[PDB]
Amino acid sequence: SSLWARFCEWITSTENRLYIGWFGVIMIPCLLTATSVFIIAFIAAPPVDIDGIREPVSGSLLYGNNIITGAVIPTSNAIGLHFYPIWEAASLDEWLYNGGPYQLIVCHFLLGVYCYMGREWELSFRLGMRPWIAVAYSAPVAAASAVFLVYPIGQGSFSDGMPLGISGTFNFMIVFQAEHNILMHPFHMLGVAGVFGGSLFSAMHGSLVTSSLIRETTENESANEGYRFGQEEETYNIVAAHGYFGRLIFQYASFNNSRSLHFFLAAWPVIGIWFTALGLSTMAFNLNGFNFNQSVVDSQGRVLNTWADIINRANLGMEVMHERNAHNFPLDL
Amino acid sequence: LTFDEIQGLTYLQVKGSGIANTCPVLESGTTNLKELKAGSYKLENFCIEPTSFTVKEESQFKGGETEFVKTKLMTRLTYTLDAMSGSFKVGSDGSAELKEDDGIDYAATTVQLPGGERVAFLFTIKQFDGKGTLDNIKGDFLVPSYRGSSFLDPKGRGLKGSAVFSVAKVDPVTGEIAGVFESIQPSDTDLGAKPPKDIKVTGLWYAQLK
Amino acid sequence: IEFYGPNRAKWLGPYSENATPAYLTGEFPGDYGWDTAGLSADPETFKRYRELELIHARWAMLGALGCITPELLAKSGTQFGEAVWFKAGAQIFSEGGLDYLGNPSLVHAQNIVATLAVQVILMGLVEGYRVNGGPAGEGLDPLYPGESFDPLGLADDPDTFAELKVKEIKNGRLAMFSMFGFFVQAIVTGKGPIQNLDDHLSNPTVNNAFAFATKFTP
Amino acid sequence: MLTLKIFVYTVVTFFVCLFIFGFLSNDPARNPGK
Amino acid sequence: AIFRFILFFQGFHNWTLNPFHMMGVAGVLGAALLCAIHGATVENTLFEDGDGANTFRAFNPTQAEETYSMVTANRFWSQIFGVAFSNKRWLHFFMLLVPVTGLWMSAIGVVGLALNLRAYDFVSQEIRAAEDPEFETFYTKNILLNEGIRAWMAAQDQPHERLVFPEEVLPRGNAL
Amino acid sequence: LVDERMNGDGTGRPFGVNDPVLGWVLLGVFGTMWAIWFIGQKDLGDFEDADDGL
Amino acid sequence: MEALVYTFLLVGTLGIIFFSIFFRDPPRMI
Amino acid sequence: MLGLGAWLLVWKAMYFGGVYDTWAPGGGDVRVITNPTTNAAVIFGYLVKSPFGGDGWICSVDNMEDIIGGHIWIGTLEILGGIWHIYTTPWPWARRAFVWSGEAYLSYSLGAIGVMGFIACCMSWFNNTAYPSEFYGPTGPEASQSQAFTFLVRDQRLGANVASAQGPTGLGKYLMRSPTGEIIFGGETMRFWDFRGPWLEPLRGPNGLDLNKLKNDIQPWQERRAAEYMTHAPLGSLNSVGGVATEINAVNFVSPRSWLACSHFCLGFFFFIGHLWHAGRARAAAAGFEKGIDRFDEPVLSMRPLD
Ligand code: CHL
Ligand code: CLA
Ligand code: CLA
Ligand code: CLA
Numbered sequence A: 001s002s003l004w005a006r007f008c009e010w011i012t013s014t015e016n017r018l019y020i021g022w023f024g025v026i027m028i029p030c031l032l033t034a035t036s037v038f039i040i041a042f043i044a045a046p047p048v049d050i051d052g053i054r055e056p057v058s059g060s061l062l063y064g065n066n067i068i069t070g071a072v073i074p075t076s077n078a079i080g081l082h083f084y085p086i087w088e089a090a091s092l093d094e095w096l097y098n099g100g101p102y103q104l105i106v107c108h109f110l111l112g113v114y115c116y117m118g119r120e121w122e123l124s125f126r127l128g129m130r131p132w133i134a135v136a137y138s139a140p141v142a143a144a145s146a147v148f149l150v151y152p153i154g155q156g157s158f159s160d161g162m163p164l165g166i167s168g169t170f171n172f173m174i175v176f177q178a179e180h181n182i183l184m185h186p187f188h189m190l191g192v193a194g195v196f197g198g199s200l201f202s203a204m205h206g207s208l209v210t211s212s213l214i215r216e217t218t219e220n221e222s223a224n225e226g227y228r229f230g231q232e233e234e235t236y237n238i239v240a241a242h243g244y245f246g247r248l249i250f251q252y253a254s255f256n257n258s259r260s261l262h263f264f265l266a267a268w269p270v271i272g273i274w275f276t277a278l279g280l281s282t283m284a285f286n287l288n289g290f291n292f293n294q295s296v297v298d299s300q301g302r303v304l305n306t307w308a309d310i311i312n313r314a315n316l317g318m319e320v321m322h323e324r325n326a327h328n329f330p331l332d333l
Numbered sequence B: 001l002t003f004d005e006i007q008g009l010t011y012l013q014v015k016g017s018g019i020a021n022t023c024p025v026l027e028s029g030t031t032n033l034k035e036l037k038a039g040s041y042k043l044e045n046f047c048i049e050p051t052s053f054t055v056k057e058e059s060q061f062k063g064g065e066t067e068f069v070k071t072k073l074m075t076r077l078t079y080t081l082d083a084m085s086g087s088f089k090v091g092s093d094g095s096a097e098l099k100e101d102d103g104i105d106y107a108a109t110t111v112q113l114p115g116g117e118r119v120a121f122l123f124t125i126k127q128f129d130g131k132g133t134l135d136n137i138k139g140d141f142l143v144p145s146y147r148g149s150s151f152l153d154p155k156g157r158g159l160k161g162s163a164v165f166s167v168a169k170v171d172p173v174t175g176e177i178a179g180v181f182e183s184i185q186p187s188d189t190d191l192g193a194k195p196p197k198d199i200k201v202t203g204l205w206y207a208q209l210k
Numbered sequence C: 001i002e003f004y005g006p007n008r009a010k011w012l013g014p015y016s017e018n019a020t021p022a023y024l025t026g027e028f029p030g031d032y033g034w035d036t037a038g039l040s041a042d043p044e045t046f047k048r049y050r051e052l053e054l055i056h057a058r059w060a061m062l063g064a065l066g067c068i069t070p071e072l073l074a075k076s077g078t079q080f081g082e083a084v085w086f087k088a089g090a091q092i093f094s095e096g097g098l099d100y101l102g103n104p105s106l107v108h109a110q111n112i113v114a115t116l117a118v119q120v121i122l123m124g125l126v127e128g129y130r131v132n133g134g135p136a137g138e139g140l141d142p143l144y145p146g147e148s149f150d151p152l153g154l155a156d157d158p159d160t161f162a163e164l165k166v167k168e169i170k171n172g173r174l175a176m177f178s179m180f181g182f183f184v185q186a187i188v189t190g191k192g193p194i195q196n197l198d199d200h201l202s203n204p205t206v207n208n209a210f211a212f213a214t215k216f217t218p
Numbered sequence D: 001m002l003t004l005k006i007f008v009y010t011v012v013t014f015f016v017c018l019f020i021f022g023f024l025s026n027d028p029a030r031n032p033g034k
Numbered sequence E: 001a002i003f004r005f006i007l008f009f010q011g012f013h014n015w016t017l018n019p020f021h022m023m024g025v026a027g028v029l030g031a032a033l034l035c036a037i038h039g040a041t042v043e044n045t046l047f048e049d050g051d052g053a054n055t056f057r058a059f060n061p062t063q064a065e066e067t068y069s070m071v072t073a074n075r076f077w078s079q080i081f082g083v084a085f086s087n088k089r090w091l092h093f094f095m096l097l098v099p100v101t102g103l104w105m106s107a108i109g110v111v112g113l114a115l116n117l118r119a120y121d122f123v124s125q126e127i128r129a130a131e132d133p134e135f136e137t138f139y140t141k142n143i144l145l146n147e148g149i150r151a152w153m154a155a156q157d158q159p160h161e162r163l164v165f166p167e168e169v170l171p172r173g174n175a176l
Numbered sequence F: 001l002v003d004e005r006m007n008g009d010g011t012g013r014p015f016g017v018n019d020p021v022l023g024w025v026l027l028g029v030f031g032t033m034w035a036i037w038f039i040g041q042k043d044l045g046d047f048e049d050a051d052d053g054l
Numbered sequence G: 001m002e003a004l005v006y007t008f009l010l011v012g013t014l015g016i017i018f019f020s021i022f023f024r025d026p027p028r029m030i
Numbered sequence H: 001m002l003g004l005g006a007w008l009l010v011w012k013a014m015y016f017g018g019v020y021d022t023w024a025p026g027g028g029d030v031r032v033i034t035n036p037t038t039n040a041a042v043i044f045g046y047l048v049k050s051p052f053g054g055d056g057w058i059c060s061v062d063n064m065e066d067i068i069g070g071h072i073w074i075g076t077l078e079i080l081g082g083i084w085h086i087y088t089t090p091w092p093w094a095r096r097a098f099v100w101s102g103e104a105y106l107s108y109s110l111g112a113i114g115v116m117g118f119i120a121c122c123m124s125w126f127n128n129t130a131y132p133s134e135f136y137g138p139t140g141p142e143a144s145q146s147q148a149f150t151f152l153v154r155d156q157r158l159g160a161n162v163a164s165a166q167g168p169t170g171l172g173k174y175l176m177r178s179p180t181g182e183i184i185f186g187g188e189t190m191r192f193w194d195f196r197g198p199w200l201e202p203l204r205g206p207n208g209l210d211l212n213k214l215k216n217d218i219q220p221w222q223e224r225r226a227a228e229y230m231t232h233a234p235l236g237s238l239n240s241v242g243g244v245a246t247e248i249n250a251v252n253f254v255s256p257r258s259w260l261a262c263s264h265f266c267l268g269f270f271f272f273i274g275h276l277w278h279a280g281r282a283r284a285a286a287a288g289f290e291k292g293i294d295r296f297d298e299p300v301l302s303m304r305p306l307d
């Protein structure tokens, strides 16, 4: 009947193909804004003073960068944590010099992905599922917000955020190892265990289910035509697969319940990523990694060397070369 | 604002508006040229505003004659050299002898050209001696070095311009002198890898005798 | 219905005489029972007082909004000469006549006795038409006509229109009390009312009203 | 730039007000229900 | 010591720029993605068999029914993400196929690095940056950083070379 | 100065508002959206105690 | 010259994404 | 009860002994607040100001008068809200907007307290008024400002100029400009020019750093604070070794600001995840499918296909 009622019925319909919902009205236009700025700025952005030391940095395809070296340059350090939109700038040849589109794209992309998580709640509630997909999607959201928002707040500049490009990502990672020693940090090792265990468990489950498919086709055609869509028959003998796994390793490390197996798959890599999401946020506030410098000492008092005392030399080599034209006072980068 | 109108403000009121990047505007003091006594004075706050940065575009589009081209600033509000001082004589008939020794005498700014080409340059009035009578106070300054000798090139290896003052308004009591300012200086070169460019800067200035 | 009936929201809560006055029990919007002087014991007197009160209400709303709006607009971003409703009338005499909205290319009004004459003629027309019924609607109800000057048509249902009656009367009583406040503030402080609000919000304990408590001393 | 700034505030506040008055408009009953 | 090996590749070989290593990280991290997706989907579009809210107690291991609504999860991920699976044969086979493809396509690049055919510097940006000074891409910062790794760590990493660099030879950075 | 700019960084103004022309747009969108919602209130569930919860 | 090749490859990848989303086979029932 | 809790702090400021201000001259000192600034147009500025740099959110609070006046506001407001809710009931626009159950009430409080944790983190890392530098230590920008001021006071008394000392790249080694025209220190504290500390503000004039005051008006207690803050800058480690990661085991130091910030950021982020748990589960339990899709009545096989 009424305009608002018909509009709400359309926007909470479930028959339009890509669902919208009520978080969708912030998810859709803001991410379209971020995409439409990023595609332009990856192609035709003028060089950007990332350092504030009057040295512009080329990042776009038109100025002698390929797909790997192409990147959206982050904002200058003199800009700091100041909110710097288009309308506060003088011209569009002045906004793009001082780290323009990074400030726009990051603040758009974060508001996009949080509302995308809300949308993943909302469509599950509209269909009648149980609502915990957004809880699992909270992990890469945290991993994005730690490098795009939390760490530049901690360092006090938007310069030290991750550059939006392939060859810029590694120049973020190596200098982060230089100043913070991420490898000697126990949260990061928990995240390494998370991603490696996630790959192991994915390959293991996809092996042990594909190894028990019930023969329903021939041996000339595809082995994927044995599953007609929307049936009620369990296409993999989970009893035989669990018996094979129990003969393979252990009978008390069973996980005979399929639901317990799926809880374990849902909770291994998510909790793996959450600890690195905390670890970046802790290293943002200058709470450093480990430090085993000059630990092994002989009976006289001289200094022996270990693998930590080689990683110290590698991090010295990175540190005395990162930001080569800025640092004068001997610390605090 | 004037000088006391600026210093009546607090730092929380100055911070965030651009009032700090200004000479204080001088009141009605025109044509007081006979109201100028002698003495080996000094200046209290010798500030100089620029208002237009033009670059001699050496590229030809008409003939063998090149003009100066209005452009855009690039960094942010990063001009108006401040707190300059020295030794500043006023003579008999209006012969000013103005010597600059101290203060923030340099500011590095970048400026495009229409055509998409950036040019960095210093704005330096280091060690200027202007000895003239209130119309063309001429003399030269130094453009010391665009970057230091300890600068690292991106792969780990490795003058004098013109300046003309003028005097427009004179405070007879406190010695506050305003006026207009012009200068022409070369650009940055990366040590002969790129030939320099002529740059004209126009503006105003302000000073307080003491 | 809560708003009118034998159990309406009376004018003192539990302290409203434990009973209405005996000559009014609901049946009309805005009935709380506050007639303690008893001035409307006769039903035709009571009908005349409703027919007067509703018109004072509908004028008091416009008199409120016209005394708020220029102090907003001129202090925000425009120019009026003077926006305060003291000197809103004195804009004809000021410099070249009354520029409506501060624009010497629209009305630019002079000739104050001609404006008075146009007001007398047109208000005589509409205040005769409100009594007898003329064009754009025959006179059928002196208070609630409901015809082609009410184009959106919300008075179709009896109950929702019965609630909107009470909404109009409640807003009317509030507008009258506010306009009395405007007039007394205009007598006392001699300043604009939104200017009085901005003066009160700066220091609420000393610019209250009691600073202006020794003005009328003999 | 002010012509841009009015437009940006207009679009932002339109979408945020659509959000808030969407969720006030009877959300937890547009489910499959019981 | 594995950390020393990682910084060994990062400072001598520049193992970062190897497309085979890009394949490897894509395989590993996409498998870690799809594990979490499948685990948070299957037990979330689950059926109704028990009474209490503890849904783990409502599974017969000897069962001829299902335990998760394939149609519902298909409609879910079709309306959020776009493309969505419809064949749980192919789903588990794809979970099989992703990380082994990543690890084999990393092993090929480790072979190519063993032969010292490293993904070190290009032609074009280097010959352009030797000519034009102010170029300074993140690429030409990573190379100038890896040189700082390789000139500092070597003199104590490998003593059988028998080299002691003077401090003037080291990449200093002009008093950072 | 040399050029023209809003100079809105570091000010500390409510909602980033500089002109009252800029200030009116907030209410001018909020009130109309509220009015459309309050009209749309007709076709919703209004009730005494028919509450949507456990 | 090669920038056009780069842009053509990126736009073609996005086009295949578009056709994969919208012009798929319908996942049909029993 | 919370309103009386706020009025306890108001009474302790106004009448009982006093509160340690960090902006009293001659070093920080305990004083008695006499005029708490309770201007509504000033106090409701901080709730609306932009949460980015320079401007700052309520972490940019500076005055103990403003702090105690805001607590006067909260003490009135919470008592008024209590007297409101004891005698009122929720109105139908809120009786249909909410999920009314047990776990839902926990769900709202978890998200609220997660926002509380994030605000506490950004308070304890940046502020120096409510968390004074003499008690908790220097802050992030304060360390860099202290280092630049210490080396300027060092190199001033030897012969080199403080103004014309051109740095490596043309910019000032010691003094340079802000983006908004002020005169500040150089190096990398151009990201930290928004700093306002009591050891630096008497040396700060209308345009920022007064060159005359840096020539003439340096205080010995300011010298001592600057000499100790660059020594005890917040550069921790998990094994409690101070300095950078490329530093030998010299000083057992981690600042308490780092522990407070990191711990409350993690403990707020987990409450946020708990809110994303319970706000889904409560509305699902109120709807009636918190235990799974029923096999008979399925909401998908009634709908249209999408094709
Ligand atoms: C049970 C508690 C209760 C009390 C104490 C009141 C109080 C009042 N209500 Mg009521 N109400 C109460 C319950 C409720 N009221 C209402 C809804 C209403 C309405 C709509 C109205 C009232 C009105 C009134 C007034 C009726 C008598 C009067 O006209 O004042 C006369 C007496 C005074 C004005 C004395 C005031 C004392 C003050 C100190 C005087 C100041 C002295 C100055 C110094 C004098 C200035 C000096 C000169 C020289 C300038 C009275 C003030 C009427 C009203 O207030 O209109 C203005 C009115 O219209 N009430 C509801 C909702 C159903 C209630 C439910 O609980
Ligand atoms: C033009 C003024 C006016 C008039 C004629 C009426 C008329 C009426 N009102 Mg009403 N009213 C008004 C203004 C007016 N109202 C205002 C401003 C308020 C808000 C405070 C109310 C609030 C109100 C309530 C709460 C109730 C009524 C009721 C009534 C009805 C019976 C009472 C009666 O006999 O009133 C006769 C009134 C007059 C003859 C007005 C005399 C005016 C002179 C100048 C004396 C007024 C001096 C004033 C009291 C001084 C202080 C002013 C300040 C408080 C504003 C009657 C139809 C009752 C009812 O059933 O509603 C329909 C009822 O319960 N009135
Ligand atoms: C902290 C404790 C607390 C809690 C849990 C509640 C909870 C509630 N209150 Mg409430 N209230 C409180 C304190 C609290 N109140 C106080 C201290 C007061 C006195 C001012 C009130 C006064 C009050 C009234 C008058 C009413 C409620 C109502 C309600 C109910 C619905 C709220 C709603 O839908 O609007 C949630 C809030 C909004 C939709 C506001 C819009 C949100 C925008 C985006 C932000 C702007 C708000 C504000 C200006 C913030 C500035 C911005 C920035 C600083 C973030 C709910 C049970 C209503 C009800 O039915 O209960 C009787 C109602 O009518 N409350
Ligand atoms: C379980 C671990 C844990 C631990 C050990 C701490 C420890 C701490 N937290 Mg904390 N916190 C935690 C978990 C934890 N938190 C979690 C999970 C959250 C949610 C994310 C928070 C959220 C949180 C906030 C929001 C804040 C802290 C703060 C603090 C610190 C001071 C506590 C305080 O001010 O009391 C709080 C006090 C009360 C709850 C009640 C006090 C009320 C009385 C009436 C006041 C006394 C009146 C008067 C002044 C005294 C008498 C005077 C009289 C004569 C007049 C302390 C280091 C505070 C801090 O210092 O920030 C860094 C702070 O602002 N925490």
Ligand SMILES: CCCCCCCCCCCCCCCC(=O)OC[C@H](CO[C@@H]1O[C@H](CS(=O)(=O)O)[C@@H](O)[C@H](O)[C@H]1O)OC(=O)CCCCCCCCCCCCCCC
Pocket (backbone or CB within 6 Å): A015, A016, A017, A018, A019, A020, A028, A031, A032, A035
């Ligand atoms: C100057 C700026 C220029 C900006 C240009 C913007 C370009 C991008 C616009 C997007 C175009 C592609 C989608 C359009 C097709 C579509 O609507 O689906 C067709 C269906 C059909 O619906 C049906 O649509 C019917 C209307 S119609 O006649 O069929 O069109 C309707 O009646 C019916 O109810 C409904 O079932 O629409 C819907 O399901 C919902 C409509 C909204 C969904 C589209 C927005 C999603 C965009 C994704 C954003 C994230 C991407 C990030 C960047 C990679």
Ligand SMILES: CCCCCCCCCCCCCCCC(=O)OC[C@H](COP(=O)(O)OC[C@@H](O)CO)OC(=O)CCCCCCCCCCCCCCC
Pocket (backbone or CB within 6 Å): A018, A224, E080, E081, E082, E083, E084, E085, E086, E087, E090, G010, G013, G014, G017, G020, G021
């Ligand atoms: C709402 C807005 C948010 C969503 C927008 C983004 C949507 C992304 C759509 C992905 C399109 C990929 C289609 C795969 C081809 C396709 O259509 O798959 C179709 C396939 C359908 O499965 P079926 O059950 O129908 O197969 C039946 C069997 O017979 C054969 O499998 O779906 C999947 O398996 C999902 C896998 C998605 C994997 C996506 C990974 C792609 C990564 C990105 C690659 C491009 C790089 C981008 C850089 C430029």
Ligand SMILES: CCCCCCCCCCCCCCCC(=O)OC[C@H](COP(=O)(O)OC[C@@H](O)CO)OC(=O)CCCCCCCCCCCCCCC
Pocket (backbone or CB within 6 Å): F014, F027, F028, F030, F031, F032, F034, F041, F046, H044, H048, H092, H093
């Ligand atoms: C610096 C200070 C910053 C202060 C920020 C203030 C933020 C305000 C947030 C308000 C939240 C309101 C929540 C919804 C409130 C809500 O639930 O609406 C519903 C409510 C009525 O509900 P009902 O439907 O039950 O009404 C009763 C009948 O309809 C029953 O059938 O209406 C109100 O009470 C509005 C209250 C004032 C709202 C503000 C006034 C709106 C109009 C003002 C716009 C002017 C228009 C000018 C045109 C140009």
Ligand SMILES: CC1=C[C@H](O)CC(C)(C)[C@H]1/C=C/C(C)=C/C=C/C(C)=C/C=C/C=C(C)/C=C/C=C(C)/C=C/C1=C(C)C[C@H](O)CC1(C)C
Pocket (backbone or CB within 6 Å): C034, C035, C036, C037, C038, C039, C056, C057, C059, C060, C062, C063, C064, C066, C067, C085, C086, C088, C089, C175, C176, C177, C179, C180
């Ligand atoms: C009921 C009762 C009962 C018991 O028994 C007894 C008693 C108590 C007696 C009673 C009571 C009564 C009362 C209270 C009354 C009151 C009234 C009023 C005040 C009205 C107003 C009323 C008021 C009103 C109308 C008002 C109106 C207004 C207006 C139009 C305005 C206009 C205007 C404007 C726009 C503005 C411009 O620039 C000008 C002018 C021209 C100025």
Ligand SMILES: CC1=C(/C=C/C(C)=C/C=C/C(C)=C/C=C/C=C(C)/C=C/C=C(C)/C=C/C2=C(C)CCCC2(C)C)C(C)(C)CCC1
Pocket (backbone or CB within 6 Å): D019, D020, D023, D024, H043, H044, H046, H047, H058, H061, H066, H067, H069, H070, H071, H073, H074, H097
């Ligand atoms: C002492 C202090 C102060 C002040 C304080 C205060 C006064 C505070 C308050 C504050 C406030 C006053 C806050 C507010 C809050 C509220 C909110 C934040 C809201 C939110 C929203 C919501 C909750 C909603 C949601 C949803 C929607 C969207 C709609 C409907 C419903 C729902 C649920 C669905 C100062 C400044 C001085 C500073 C210092 C400290």
Ligand SMILES: [Cl-]
Pocket (backbone or CB within 6 Å): A329, A331, A332, A333, H144, H147, H187, H188, H189
């Ligand atoms: Cl530094």
Ligand SMILES: [Cl-]
Pocket (backbone or CB within 6 Å): A171, A322, A323, E141, E142, E145
């Ligand atoms: Cl680098």
Ligand SMILES: [Fe+2]
Pocket (backbone or CB within 6 Å): A205, A261, A262, A265, E038, E039, E042
């Ligand atoms: Fe699985």
